[PDB]
Design a protein around this ligand. Structure first.
Ligand SMILES: Nc1ncnc2c1ncn2[C@@H]1O[C@H](CSCC[C@H](N)C(=O)O)[C@@H](O)[C@H]1O
Ligand SMILES: [Cl-]
Length: 279
């Protein structure tokens, strides 16, 4: 704690325009799914959203909730590909306004709602839930309430797709032969300052405590390494504009974050899973 207040430059202070320098046009900010090896980033992001949505067994007329909708790409796929009502919620005002404006332009015969709202305040009954990349922003003290609230707002036949990043235990790493180095440790400290993760077993434990069953987990480890690689290449290609919009310090922090995380997935320290939860 510094005695004098300092309005500093944070990676969280950048505009939508900055993110458009390296995200694909749909502005997905989570692991893509290279269902075909030759897919572009945009095609793999659409394929990731389709992968999650397909696991929900959506039927015409249902209501889908996207917990943590970001810049709206998941809800666009849902509106375009299913005859369903949608609700998207986010804690980001920029993402809220962006998703609202994006989805307002999409023809639809169903209801569409975008809200600046946390899951802890959400009580609407919905038929299915998708949540991609939101869980890693939750504190572990709130995990149980999250799964309990998710269970409660679903019907008897309800299904939830939970997509989130994962870590391994030391024993599993020693088993798998993953050696964590000092530079890895220093990067984890960089994360704790600028930005602990659950293991796959933790997700099973918490979902089951809320009376969900885990029907499926699908791991996308190397898809994330490739997703982060492309993001980093795009940002580097747009370096001059990133520095003009922000600064070399902000550019460097993002580049360090993207390429460090890429290394963690490539090396096998981290993973990312889609959990199909049923009721
Ligand atoms: N407690 C909470 N309740 C609701 N949304 C939350 C939340 N904590 C984080 N979020 C939202 O979760 C999102 C994480 S970013 C992932 C965005 C999108 N699903 C994608 O795949 O690109 C952001 O929109 C963030 O505002
Ligand atoms: Cl900016």
């Amino acid at each position: 704690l510094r005695p004098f207040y300092e309005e500093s430059q944070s990676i969280y202070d950048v505009s939508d325009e900055f993110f458009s320098l390296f995200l694909d046009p749909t502005m997905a900010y989570t692991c893509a799914y290279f269902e075909r090896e030759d897919m572009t980033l945009e095609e793999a992001q659409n394929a990731k959203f389709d992968l999650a949505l397909d696991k929900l067994h959506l039927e015409p007329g249902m209501t889908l909730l996207d917990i943590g909708c970001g810049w709206g790409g998941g809800l666009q796929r849902a509106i375009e590909n299913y005859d369903v009502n949608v609700i998207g919620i986010t804690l980001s005002r920029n993402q809220f306004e962006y998703s609202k404006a994006k989805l307002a332009k999409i023809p639809t015969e169903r209801s569409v709602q975008v809200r600046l709202q946390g899951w802890d305040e959400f009580t609407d009954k919905v038929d299915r839930i998708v949540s991609i990349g939101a869980f890693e922003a939750f504190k572990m003290e709130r995990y149980a309430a999250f799964f309990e609230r998710s269970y409660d707002i679903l019907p008897d036949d309800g299904r939830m797709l939970l997509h989130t990043i994962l870590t391994y235990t030391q024993k599993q790493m020693h088993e798998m032969g993953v050696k964590v180095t000092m530079s890895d440790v220093r990067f984890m400290k960089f994360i704790g300052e600028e930005i602990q993760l659950p293991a796959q077993e933790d997700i099973f434990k918490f979902a089951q405590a809320a009376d969900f069953s885990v029907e499926k987990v699908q791991l996308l480890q190397q898809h994330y390494a490739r997703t982060l690689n492309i993001w980093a290449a795009n940002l580097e290609a747009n370096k001059d504009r990133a520095i003009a919009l922000q600064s070399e310090e902000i550019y460097n922090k993002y580049m360090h974050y993207l390429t460090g995380c890429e290394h963690f997935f490539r090396k096998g320290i981290s993973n990312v899973g889609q959990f199909t939860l049923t009721k």
